[PDB]
RNA sequence: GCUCGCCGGAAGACCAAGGGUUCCUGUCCAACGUUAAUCGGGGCAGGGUGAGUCGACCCCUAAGGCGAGGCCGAAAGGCGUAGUCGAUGGGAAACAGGUUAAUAUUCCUGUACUUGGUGUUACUGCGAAGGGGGGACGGAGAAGGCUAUGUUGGCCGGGCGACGGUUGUCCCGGUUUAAGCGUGUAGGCUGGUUUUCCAGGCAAAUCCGGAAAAUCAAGGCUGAGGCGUGAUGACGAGGCACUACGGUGCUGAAGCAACAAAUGCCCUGCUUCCAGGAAAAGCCUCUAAGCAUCAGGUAACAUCAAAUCGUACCCCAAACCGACACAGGUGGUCAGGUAGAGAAUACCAAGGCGCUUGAGAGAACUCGGGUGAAGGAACUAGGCAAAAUGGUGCCGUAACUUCGGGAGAAGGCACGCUGAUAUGUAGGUGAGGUCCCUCGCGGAUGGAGCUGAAAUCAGUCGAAGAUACCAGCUGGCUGCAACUGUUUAUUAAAAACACAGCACUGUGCAAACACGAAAGUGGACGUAUACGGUGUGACGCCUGGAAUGGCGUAAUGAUGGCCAGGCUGUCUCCACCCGAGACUCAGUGAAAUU
RNA sequence: AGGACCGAACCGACUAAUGUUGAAAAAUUAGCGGAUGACUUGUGGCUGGGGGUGAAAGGCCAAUCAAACCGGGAGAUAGCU
């Protein structure tokens, strides 16, 4: 959600932020974090989706500082949590689960030669056993026309199609809240602590 | 531990002087100068089996040489560690 | 106002040590040319 | 030794890095101290730093270097594993009083805590290179309690005033008690107890977590502070005897309540926001093989051990960095009262000092200032400088605009002290009594006493009551630039530099590009709302001289200039006074240049 | 909430004066700027000279920088004094 703001004073005069009232407030899950030195934590997020059968109930959203994209917490069956994407569609105490089956709805994963053609589809896998690369950015969608023949075809965000093995999962449904685009930063201090250093100009 | 002719070598020269006084009668402590190294055991087993009398505790602390001149060169002072035996109750020489 | 010269001792001997000296090929070289030349001390005694 | 003055959120004190005996005593005056010096940070000789509880060392670890092996390369070397160094982080523990010429939480006395081992008694599922817990974290803001601390009152000890009064509602001093243990209150966190199973924690678990049942709602944990022990104590105002007159020995009364209140503890907490905010070791728990009369762990007592290293001294400076006993700089800690909102400003408490040259005359001239006949910018390139306003309450406050602002607009009245409401009011805090109960560090009434704003009326004194200091001049038009910001250390702080947004192209991961004989690496532990380059720079008219932006814009600016009220020795035009030099004298004592 | 306002410690030195064998091979005084964020600082490491770095002045790299210092070629060259 966002919100504008009263120009009080300028510079803060046209910030916009883009945030969630829905997330929680404090600390994440302490021993899925690591140093990640060049100062942000690193959330361990299972890209892979390799624990198939058990399924698992959401508990709560977290924020991500590392990517653009948000994540979820889960609960496995058996006392296990990790976290994946959180897709737009989520909501608290839904029942994710991966598989062969993998029924149709936004949470689940499943290999590319029974991907229903016309639905969005993100997080896909291209190489054996890697996973996790296209579609992590926030406000993208990949939709299929084609799967038939030896490779699937995919209608990517950058405007181009390729075509894939069908030997590899991939996330069904779509990524979350497209607002990102949106934020502006309303003033030169909001680019300091985000690392970007100003620009020298060539013919300055 | 033992050894003799170790704690013979510890013991250098006992030390005179206005504290060393005033502390023999109110604090019954003798003040020694011991060797470079000179550990708590040695001190310790030096005055209680040389002087033969009871050794309550010890303690140390390094004298740093001075700066001595006297011509065209400088000059140093050798270093050496003050001793303080504090006995039980018994007093000696 | 700051004099160029502020002392610290473990920046002097991280740099300018006598193992920091040695460590290297050619710090062995000026360590020859001060044993050629013949000082009394040769960088710093801890 | 007496008197005056300065600093006193320092010019005071313990300290860190650095310095290296500069710390203390006796003696000496060649040089050293800008003068003499009998003195000293100068010399001579002697002394002085006492650690299981202070720190360093040690265990582990970020940035980063080395990096046995190993990849590549003419040598050199590039890169890098398993490892290892590397505090700016974490990890064991102590306080009070006293003492010397110098050192103390280290020395004497009293009282605790912590680590490992041995012996005895008694009990026992012990056991990691493994797992879990915790260690373990950003910025801003608010409330309450308490302490250190300050005041009043009581009490104790000493006095009756060098000049009017002062046995009083008087004056002077004190009213300190720690660490630890027990109690678990203010406050915060979490729903507990029992039982069954488990694909997760590479195998395992009674442990972490998950999945099903019954009961109860207040149990469990962290946690400042108050009370008891500590303390039939020490310290203490003030005393008594022997004296090298320096001290020694001994004794020593009261040592409590209320109020205010810290930047200090509860609080690594609570609320809120997004930029989402190190890792590891010690410790507890759980098991795998094994051990299971053994060994290890657990409760108590006694004993042993806790090594080495620094401990003097300045440290907002005479001792460090500037060649100096130099008007510069240098990490953080302690932060009293009165007036004030404040660590600013003025005075004082403890403490440290009057800055290592002085004494005469009061001339010209130089500097810091003060006052001033009459005018008030006429002086100057230029209200530069100087002068002037400066604080609070009441009526009241314009042009413009992005509606936040301009604004404290300007402009009219009052500000001291004393009595009344009230022999001190609103508010905060709070004693004694009453009642109830687990019965306590407990709760409802209730006000003793203490502290204590703000306003009104009346009277009174001074020329002047924001009485001193500190402490915006005000209103209009206009160029550039949206703004806060950056630089030519040491002559230009601007229109030059930077700017969020915006416009264009390319890039599907073994990504573009860049770095390299190669290996390797950044981008990036990113994923087309992402990445690299280019031009412009909030915003409105808009982009057909019109984003190498045309025209303006509220606010902003060590930015250029004008006028208007007041103001002034800036000027007319200089006069007097307070200071430091310049004049003389005692002593030391150069340079530029020839 | 705030690169918001005034104003301390603190930081840079805009104006005016002084200083130029100075207290000082860049410092003081009085106004003036920021003053919770694009702030500052200690400690430790890295980036090295036809290079590093640079909110870009051709600034800085130990009181020096329109190519640091030391040693070497070198008693270079000089048509100059």
């Avoid at chain 1, 499943?110 to 896909?124: E, Q």
């Avoid at chain 3, 002392?7 to 300018?16: D, E, G």
């Avoid at chain 3, 006598?18 to 290297?24: E, G, N």
Wanted: with cysteine; aromatic share 4%.
């Amino acid at each position: 959600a966002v919100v504008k703001c009263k120009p009080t004073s300028p510079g803060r005069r046209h910030v916009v932020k883009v945030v969630n009232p829905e997330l929680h407030k404090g600390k994440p899950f302490a021993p899925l974090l690591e140093k990640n030195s060049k100062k942000q934590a690193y959330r361990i997020v299972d890209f892979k989706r390799n624990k198939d059968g058990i399924p698992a109930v959401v508990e709560r959203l977290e924020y991500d500082p590392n990517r653009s994209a948000n994540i979820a917490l889960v609960l496995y069956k058996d006392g296990e949590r990790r976290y994946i994407l959180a897709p737009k569609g989520l909501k608290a105490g839904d029942q994710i689960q991966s598989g062969v089956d993998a029924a149709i709805k936004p949470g689940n994963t499943l290999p590319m030669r029974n991907i229903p053609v016309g639905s969005t589809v993100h997080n896909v896998e291209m190489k054996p056993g890697k996973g996790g690369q296209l579609a992590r950015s926030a406000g993208t969608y990949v939709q299929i026309v084609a799967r038939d023949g030896a490779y699937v075809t995919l209608r990517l965000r950058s405007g181009e199609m390729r075509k894939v093995e069908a030997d590899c999962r991939a996330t069904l449904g779509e990524v979350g809240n497209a607002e990102h685009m949106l934020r502006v930063l309303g003033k030169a201090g909001a680019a300091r602590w985000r690392g970007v250093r100003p620009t020298v100009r060539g013919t300055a | 531990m033992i050894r003799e002719e170790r704690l013979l070598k510890v013991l250098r020269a006992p030390h005179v002087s206005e504290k060393a006084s005033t502390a023999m009668e109110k604090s019954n402590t003798i003040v020694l100068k011991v060797a470079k190294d000179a550990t708590k055991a040695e001190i310790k087993a030096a005055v209680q089996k040389l002087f033969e009398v009871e050794v309550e505790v010890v303690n140390t602390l390094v004298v740093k040489g001075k700066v001595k001149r006297h011509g065209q060169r400088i000059g140093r002072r050798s270093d050496w560690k003050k001793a303080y035996v504090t006995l039980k109750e018994g007093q000696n020489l | 106002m700051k004099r160029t010269f502020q002392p610290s001792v473990l920046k002097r001997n991280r740099s300018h040590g006598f193992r920091a000296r040695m460590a290297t090929k050619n710090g062995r070289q000026v360590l020859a040319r001060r044993r050629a030349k013949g000082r009394a001390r040769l960088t710093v005694s801890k």
